[PDB]
Amino acid sequence: IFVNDDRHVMAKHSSVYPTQEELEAVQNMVSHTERALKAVSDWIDEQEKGRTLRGVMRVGLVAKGLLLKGDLDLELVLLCKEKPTTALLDKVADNLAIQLTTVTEDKYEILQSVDDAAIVIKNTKEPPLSLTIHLTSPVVREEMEKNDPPDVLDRQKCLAALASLRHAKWFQARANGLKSCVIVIRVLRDLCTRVPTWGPLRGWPLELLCEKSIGTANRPMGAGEALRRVLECLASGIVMPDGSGIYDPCEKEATDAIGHLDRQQREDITQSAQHALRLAAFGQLHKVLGMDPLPVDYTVQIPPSTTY
Amino acid sequence: GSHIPFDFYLCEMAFPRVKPAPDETSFSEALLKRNQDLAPNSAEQASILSLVTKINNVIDNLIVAPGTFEVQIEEVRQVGSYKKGTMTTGHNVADLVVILKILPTLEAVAALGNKVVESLRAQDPSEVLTMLTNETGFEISSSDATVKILITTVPPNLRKLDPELHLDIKVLQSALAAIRHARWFEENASQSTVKVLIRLLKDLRIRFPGFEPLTPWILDLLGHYAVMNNRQPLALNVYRRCLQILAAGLFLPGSVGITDPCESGNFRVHTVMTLEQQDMVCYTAQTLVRILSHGGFRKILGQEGDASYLASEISTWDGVIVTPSEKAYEKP
Numbered sequence: 001i002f003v004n005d006d007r008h009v010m011a012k013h014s015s016v017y018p019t020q021e022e023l024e025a026v027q028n029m030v031s032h033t034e035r036a037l038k039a040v041s042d043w044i045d046e047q048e049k050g051r052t053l054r055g056v057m058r059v060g061l062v063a064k065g066l067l068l069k070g071d072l073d074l075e076l077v078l079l080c081k082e083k084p085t086t087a088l089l090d091k092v093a094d095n096l097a098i099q100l101t102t103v104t105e106d107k108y109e110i111l112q113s114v115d116d117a118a119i120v121i122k123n124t125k126e127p128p129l130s131l132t133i134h135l136t137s138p139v140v141r142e143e144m145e146k147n148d149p150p151d152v153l154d155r156q157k158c159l160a161a162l163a164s165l166r167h168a169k170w171f172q173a174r175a176n177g178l179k180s181c182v183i184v185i186r187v188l189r190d191l192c193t194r195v196p197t198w199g200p201l202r203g204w205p206l207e208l209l210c211e212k213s214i215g216t217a218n219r220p221m222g223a224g225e226a227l228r229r230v231l232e233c234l235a236s237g238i239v240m241p242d243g244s245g246i247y248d249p250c251e252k253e254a255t256d257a258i259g260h261l262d263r264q265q266r267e268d269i270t271q272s273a274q275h276a277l278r279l280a281a282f283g284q285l286h287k288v289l290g291m292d293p294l295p296v297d298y299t300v301q302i303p304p305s306t307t308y
Numbered sequence: 309g310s311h312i313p314f315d316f317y318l319c320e321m322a323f324p325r326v327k328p329a330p331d332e333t334s335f336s337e338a339l340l341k342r343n344q345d346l347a348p349n350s351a352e353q354a355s356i357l358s359l360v361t362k363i364n365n366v367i368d369n370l371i372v373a374p375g376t377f378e379v380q381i382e383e384v385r386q387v388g389s390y391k392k393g394t395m396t397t398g399h400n401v402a403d404l405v406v407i408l409k410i411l412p413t414l415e416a417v418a419a420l421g422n423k424v425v426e427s428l429r430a431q432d433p434s435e436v437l438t439m440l441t442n443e444t445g446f447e448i449s450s451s452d453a454t455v456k457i458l459i460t461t462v463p464p465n466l467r468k469l470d471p472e473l474h475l476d477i478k479v480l481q482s483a484l485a486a487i488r489h490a491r492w493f494e495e496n497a498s499q500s501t502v503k504v505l506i507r508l509l510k511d512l513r514i515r516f517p518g519f520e521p522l523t524p525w526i527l528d529l530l531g532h533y534a535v536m537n538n539r540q541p542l543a544l545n546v547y548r549r550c551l552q553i554l555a556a557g558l559f560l561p562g563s564v565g566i567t568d569p570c571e572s573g574n575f576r577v578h579t580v581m582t583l584e585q586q587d588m589v590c591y592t593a594q595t596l597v598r599i600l601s602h603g604g605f606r607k608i609l610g611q612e613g614d615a616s617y618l619a620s621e622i623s624t625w626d627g628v629i630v631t632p633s634e635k636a637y638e639k640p
């Protein structure tokens with residue numbers, strides 16, 4: 001059922017799904033940078049021997065396979081045995097410049113920000129890719145939950161890096177295998193961009209909303225039916241001031257994924273979704289997708305890591 | 309279509325609440341107060357019960373002792389609002405379905421009606437009644453209550469109808485379906501809260517012409533479904549689900565909606581509403597869902613005058629501007 005609605009959501013999908021040239025550039029930069037951090041680590045373990053860096057992880061768009069046409073922002077997480085500091089940031093950012101040279105001749109600008117507790121990497125392509133390397137440590141969660149240098153990195157910034165890392169693991173386990181979920185999220189990510197009313201849902205809240213709504217169905221759905229179920233969900237008044245709200249699965253304390261929305265946003269987003277639903281029900285879903293009426297493993301965008 | 313719209317109460321385990329469910333005490337009080345305003349007084353149910361007894365008896369008799377009378381009655385059933393106990397004040401009318409043995413002609417419908425009222429008048433010459441026929445049977449009413457008699461026949465006679473000699477096949481089939489509804493209702497929807505809600509939905513549909521296309525039968529199935537289809541019944545105020553399922557397109561194209569329990573094989577009750585009407589019902593409930601969230605339940609329940617404007621006009625709820633949902637259906 002919903003053949004025509006499947007045609008439109010899949011064609012819109014194609015329209016927003018990044019190109020091989022974008023993807024190939026992502027693969028390259030990510031691969032280069034991962035393999036470079038692999039060395040930056042190996043180099044340290046040697047200095048100590050004569051641990052500190054526990055791993056490198058993909059998060060955000062890259063990991064979730066949520067890259068679309070025009071996305072120039074990638075992200076990684078750097079795990080540190082201890083609590084990352086300013087000394088380690090400078091040491092990594094610097095040595096990273098030397099280790100990249102062992103993997104590629106491409107030139108990357110390396111810029112650090114002690115405040116963002118991260119190391120940004122920009123390449124030289126038009127437009128340029130920007131990959132942010134967030135440094136953090138579990139020893140930080142333990143501590144928030146309950147005798148070190150004087151240059152600890154911003155706990156808030158380090159705690160957020162763990163959150164996204166938990167979002168990335170959750171997404172791969174729950175959302176990925178959910179049929180039409182990753183597709184609906186992409187096509188709805190593009191709608192949150194086009195319609196400023198949906199803006200506030202962009203990212204985590206949208207991802208959760210789509211997994212929840214689509215996951216509560218009895219059986220697997222197509223892209224058409226799946227997207228509808230998300231409209232219905234909203235149309236029911238889920239994000240209204242009073243009501244469950246979207247509960248955050250990656251939080252030990254009860255957290256609302258959309259608790260930041262304000263009374264009017266909740267009203268507008270709901271009234272929009274409501275209208276979008278009926279439009280879909282009456283064969284006008286192309287209008288919700290901002291397109292003209294028409295006449296495998298899409299989840300896997302870039303290869304999994306070898307280095308990590 | 310095998311498509312089931314979204315229902316929060318069908319999969320609640322997947323949406324844990326973050327902060328304790330707000331206190332809807334006032335809402336529950338108003339819901340009961342209104343049920344009380346709509347409920348028939350003690351004078352009203354006496355007059356009805358009295359008239360329903362009198363007539364039902366005369367008919368019971370005519371069935372055991374057909375006498376010399378040329379109208380064979382095979383069965384009589386109490387159906388509709390009076391039987392289910394969802395009656396509203398001001399409308400003291402009961403529905404009786406009388407299944408005739410032979411073909412239900414226009415002459416017979418008048419003979420039976422006049423024979424019935426004549427029996428009441430022989431028993432009680434003092435009480436004044438009036439008896440009128442129509443195209444669906446006849447009516448008998450006193451000074452404060454009316455009993456509608458819905459004529460039909462034993463199915464055997466349905467395939468043998470005559471477009472010009474007997475009553476409309478549709479009318480006869482409607483009366484029979486009425487019997488199945490009451491049977492199903494007494495059997496399945498006979499719950500204290502279900503009956504209270506159906507009375508409130510009947511009121512909502514009257515103050516909001518958006519809900520006009522909704523029939524008594526759909527309302528019955530909707531109230532029962534909102535209360536019972538989930539272990540225990542849902543609290544009366546948790547009414548909110550009725551609006552929420554209409555809003556998520558339970559009665560929209562492509563949706564299973566509700567299947568008729570009194571028909572075969574898998575009929576969608578909302579299939580009797582046009583596409584335009586479906587759209588209308590939906591977007592009406594869509595506005596009322598939003599309006600209830602803004603704490604406008606006193607208006608929704610009709611305790612604050614007319615609110616029919618809420619569904620077509622912009623309203624400001626505590627600084628929040630509410631824009632009513634609009635037509636999305638396009639007549640090709």
Ligand SMILES: O=c1ccn([C@@H]2O[C@H](COP(=O)(O)OP(=O)(O)OP(=O)(O)O)[C@@H](O)[C@H]2O)c(=O)[nH]1
Binds near residue numbers: 388394481
């Ligand atoms: O001609 C017919 C044939 C059949 N029926 C059947 O009888 C029932 C009449 O239903 P009503 O119109 O009386 O609605 P109600 O009793 O639920 O609420 P009130 O307005 O009475 O308070 C309907 O459910 C229909 O199936 C008729 O009403 N008229």
Ligand SMILES: [Mg+2]
Binds near residue numbers: 403
């Ligand atoms: Mg009635």
